[PDB]
Symmetry: D2
Subunit: 93 residues, 4 copies
């Protein structure tokens, strides 16, 4: 199941998400919430296999029928794509 | 070695390339010329592995230290990227 | 939404899946079922972006937390990888 | 241009490579030798774009007709593939 940090729980309380004891996770906009770290590890993994830019990954994810709300998705995605060495090497050309 | 079609040979003579009997290929600007068909099969293979845009593949090839002159490169490259189903599916976003 | 063929419905009835008239799709193992053709074009898209082998795509999908049941996934997946030209070119070496 | 370390020069002499003072680089099997570190950063870049296994990258490079001889290619290549996070994540499933 999901593991929420103090910072996650903090972000979630700010969003106004609610913890669901029955289903063993937090819920927001009607979806189970993906923790910040889980989201990072997932998006980082997906970028390594495709090296799609920020705009392409974002737009694809919104069409994905994802059952999850990804905490700090955009911020995490922007950080992943802008610090990718291989992509930096590509546009260096 | 390379296999040149009548149309390749046509393009090459117009370019002023020369056949090198010792090396079994045509030479131009100090570089062996890659036939139109070999160029297509190579660039298409490389795109399938990366799905880099026209601009990205072009800029990279210019930095590649490739020992070969690629016959009809841009034309072949633009066609490959503009007819890619996967890239079209990506940009559908 | 999903379009189910005669062949989908026969496979689904054979599985013992059940149709949800209210929610306008078939359900199996607690999941809405993705038709055979929709599954193919999706899995085909994912291979073009990664060119992962049969075994690797299978294992990854089983870990995917997919909200959909993919009809004839394994059979379709094998068809995709074994007819992929780019991968055929890769192992040709 | 190329920078050769003492370790490169040592490895090269063992290979029976030859230094060309006039063109100020080493030559081996009729090809200019790319230093160990340049070879690493190039091969690492290519793996990030493809994540091909050791055996496939190797077989492909042998068919590539690269204009450079890559110092310690196989050893460097195996190191690249066995320390890749994305590939490690893939078989983890
Ligand atoms: Zn990248
Ligand atoms: Zn493409
Ligand atoms: Zn493939
Ligand atoms: Zn890898």
């Amino acid at each position: 199941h999901f593991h929420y940090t103090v910072t996650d729980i903090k972000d979630l309380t700010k969003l106004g998400a609610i913890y669901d004891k029955t289903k063993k996770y937090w819920v927001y906009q009607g979806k189970p919430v993906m923790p910040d770290q889980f989201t990072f590890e997932l998006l980082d993994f997906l970028h390594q296999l495709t090296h799609l830019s920020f705009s392409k990954m974002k737009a694809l994810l919104e069409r994905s029928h994802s059952p999850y709300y990804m905490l700090n998705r955009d911020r995490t995605l922007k950080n992943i794509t802008e610090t990718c060495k291989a992509c930096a090497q590509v546009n260096a050309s």
